[PDB]
Structures are given as structure tokens and as C-alpha cells.
Amino acid sequence: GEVPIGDPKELNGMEIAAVYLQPIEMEPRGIDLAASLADIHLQADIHALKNNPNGFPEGFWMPYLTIAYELKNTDTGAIKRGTLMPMVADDGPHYGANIAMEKDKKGGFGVGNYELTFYISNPEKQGFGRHVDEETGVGKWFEPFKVDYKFKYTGTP
Amino acid sequence: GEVPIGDPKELNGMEIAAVYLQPIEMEPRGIDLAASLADIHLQADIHALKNNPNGFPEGFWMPYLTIAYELKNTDTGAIKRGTLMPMVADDGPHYGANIAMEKDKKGGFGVGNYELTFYISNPEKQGFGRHVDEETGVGKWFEPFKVDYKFKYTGTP
Ligand SMILES: [Cu+2]
Ligand SMILES: [Cu+2]
């Protein structure tokens, strides 16, 4: 099952929500941390708001974003970071990564209170274009930004 | 303004339509042929159908596809090849490219009868991931395939 992380944020034309669930199995193999080595799949759910200023229809998935995460256990002080990769599951596309929590050898990533940050950059960083003509053009992309959430990690689903 | 190319195809859980319009100014500069040097913008509209076998909800843009094209004037024999690149306009994301027709340097790309082929590969070729576990996984991706259109080019819209 999915566990929502905090409240979603609306900014820069997008609704940005965080969820975690049980480790998943992703193809192609060898990119994402193997399910066997993980305790959660962390997921960023990011879709266009109404009147998205970059032309994305409401509710469309926001593609080609560059997304990193920072996860901090505030009880122990442990911090880890990584990237969320684009992929598709039965409920649609998202950005995600399997993460070791209890299993992390370094330790300190167990049940407890957590702060999560997403660091997001616009699709142009990956070569995604935008029309700028009068007839069909759209507005400028957002500058790099972050969003912050707090949640209680209750253990690997 | 917008000119439909042949008839849409419905394969591999996607609707695959082709259109052309006037040349467009796109950012970032340099990725694509400058509108100055082009006569059309060639565009592929590819969205998920109902019950898409790869987890995309109905109507969602299909992202991370590799779309090569081959455009042949069957009257003159002129042939040119390229790739459509992902981008967004005020009505949503698509894959497109500016193309010189009357302005082409070798010539033979004027008004007349044309054959257009799209060579399409699945998102995994660009590293887009897919859940395969039982609870959240989706079906395998289509093998690379081609779609063919026949149309009359009447000049820049
Ligand atoms: Cu995932
Ligand atoms: Cu375009």
C-alpha cells in the first residue's frame, strides 16, 4: 500500500506530492536499487495544475524533470540523498527510487521522524524544448527549486 | 494552420497521428533547425488509448519515445531523415522538428506527393523504467515498429 508523505505543494504550474510504498521491481534491471536490498519505494507524483504556464494540460504528468531527494531522520541525524528516476507503474508514470531504510548498513534510517526534500530542475536541462512563437509559444521555465515535507516513517510496508 | 498527415494509427496502446504546421521558434536555440531555414514543423501526436498495456492513463502523452522519420517526395525521389524531439506548445507536449521543404538545399522537397515513415522505439531505449512486480507492474513494451503515411504537401500553411 501507498503511504502519503505530508501534504502536496502547488507551485510553478505543478502539484508535487510524495508517497512511499513497498520496494518494487523495476526494469531495466541494475539501475534502481534491487527490491531485495530496499525497505521502501519513494515516489514523487508531479502533475500540471490548471493554466500551467508551460503548456501542459491539467493533470498531465510533468515529464523530463531532474529530481533529487534528501531524506533526513530527525531523531538520529542521518541523511541520505539520491535521484528519483522516471518510470511507469500500473497507476501511471512517476519519479521513484527504491531506498534502504532499516537495511541501510550505515544505520540510523529506521522507524522515526523524517524530513524529505525534493530538488527539482526544469525539463530544458535534459534537452526538452518549448515553443516560443507568438501563435503557439509558452512561458519561461521555473528556476531550480525545492519542496519540503515531514512525515513519520512507520516501517517497510 | 495545422495540416493533418494521412490517417491516425492505433497500435501498441497508442494513438499515433502526424501533422505539419508553420515553422516554429523553439528554445533552447540550436537544438533544432532555425525557423528561418525551415518551411514546416513536422509533428507526431502520440497519446495513450484506453486500457494502455504499459500503465499510461487514457489520454496521457507518451513520453521518452525515440521517433525517427523518413520523408520522401515520391514525384522527385528526394529523401531526408531525422528525429523528432520532445517539446511543449501551448496545447501540450509533442514530438516535432522544423524541416526545410522549398528551402531545402539539394532541392526536390517542394509541393507534391509524399510518403512519411515514423520509426518508433519504446521509452526503455532512453532509460525510462517500468515496474514489473506483481502488485504494481505493467506489461512489456512494444518492439520497435514503423507507421506509414501518404500526404500531399501544399506549401507552408
Ligand atoms: Cu517507481
Ligand atoms: Cu514542436
Side-chain angles (χ1 to χ4, degrees):
Chain A
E2 281 192 352
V3 177
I5 286 163
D7 298 302
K9 304 293 192 164
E10 302 188 353
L11 60 175
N12 298 333
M14 303 173 284
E15 175 171 37
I16 311 170
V19 302
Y20 75 88
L21 58 154
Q22 75 279 354
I24 61 83
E25 311 185 300
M26 198 200 74
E27 275 180 24
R29 313 308 211 132
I31 307 320
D32 189 47
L33 176 70
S36 58
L37 293 166
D39 295 294
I40 66 170
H41 193 66
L42 178 65
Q43 180 168 324
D45 285 322
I46 308 181
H47 304 84
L49 305 161
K50 293 176 171 56
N51 280 311
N52 174 275
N54 307 112
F56 280 86
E58 183 196 7
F60 267 36
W61 184 58
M62 301 295 305
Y64 296 89
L65 294 170
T66 295
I67 307 206
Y69 76 84
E70 178 168 329
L71 187 53
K72 183 179 194 233
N73 180 321
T74 59
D75 305 326
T76 73
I79 300 171
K80 58 158 69 182
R81 27 176 74 89
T83 59
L84 299 181
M85 301 157 296
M87 64 186 81
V88 72
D90 62 357
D91 294 335
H94 63 253
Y95 300 89
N98 274 354
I99 296 175
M101 299 290 289
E102 293 93 322
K103 294 176 182 293
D104 192 318
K105 275 309 161 198
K106 206 211 180 102
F109 293 102
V111 171
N113 304 278
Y114 280 83
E115 287 167 353
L116 171 69
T117 305
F118 290 157
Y119 292 96
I120 300 164
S121 282
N122 75 46
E124 183 166 309
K125 223 173 163 272
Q126 303 182 11
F128 190 89
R130 65 176 178 108
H131 290 205
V132 297
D133 56 294
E134 179 158 50
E135 202 166 80
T136 70
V138 306
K140 296 176 115 185
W141 286 114
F142 54 86
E143 295 283 293
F145 71 97
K146 57 168 189 192
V147 290
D148 287 290
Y149 314 83
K150 295 182 194 207
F151 68 110
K152 64 212 207 96
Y153 177 51
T154 56
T156 166
Chain B
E2 188 171 302
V3 179
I5 291 172
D7 301 314
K9 285 100 178 93
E10 288 195 11
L11 301 123
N12 305 125
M14 312 177 289
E15 167 154 279
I16 303 156
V19 303
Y20 70 88
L21 62 145
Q22 75 273 2
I24 57 95
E25 280 257 290
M26 187 198 98
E27 292 222 348
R29 184 184 61 80
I31 286 198
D32 198 24
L33 190 73
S36 147
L37 311 167
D39 298 282
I40 66 173
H41 195 65
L42 175 65
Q43 176 174 319
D45 290 315
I46 307 179
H47 298 83
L49 301 161
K50 217 191 178 62
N51 310 300
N52 170 271
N54 307 117
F56 282 83
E58 179 177 19
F60 268 34
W61 184 56
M62 301 301 299
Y64 301 92
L65 298 173
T66 299
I67 306 176
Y69 67 87
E70 179 178 300
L71 183 64
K72 201 234 174 200
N73 181 323
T74 54
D75 308 324
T76 67
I79 176 147
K80 75 169 39 176
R81 293 170 180 101
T83 59
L84 302 184
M85 298 300 292
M87 66 189 78
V88 67
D90 59 4
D91 66 332
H94 66 247
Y95 301 89
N98 281 344
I99 297 185
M101 298 299 277
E102 291 88 337
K103 300 172 192 174
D104 179 271
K105 317 234 220 156
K106 304 192 187 193
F109 294 101
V111 163
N113 301 293
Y114 281 80
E115 286 182 345
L116 169 63
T117 305
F118 285 156
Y119 301 89
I120 303 169
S121 297
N122 70 48
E124 191 166 318
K125 194 172 174 78
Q126 294 179 207
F128 186 84
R130 149 180 100 91
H131 292 204
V132 304
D133 49 288
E134 193 182 336
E135 289 85 352
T136 73
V138 308
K140 282 196 178 302
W141 278 118
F142 56 82
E143 309 298 311
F145 71 104
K146 63 194 218 94
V147 294
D148 288 296
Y149 312 83
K150 277 177 188 207
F151 79 104
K152 277 143 130 52
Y153 175 55
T154 43
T156 298

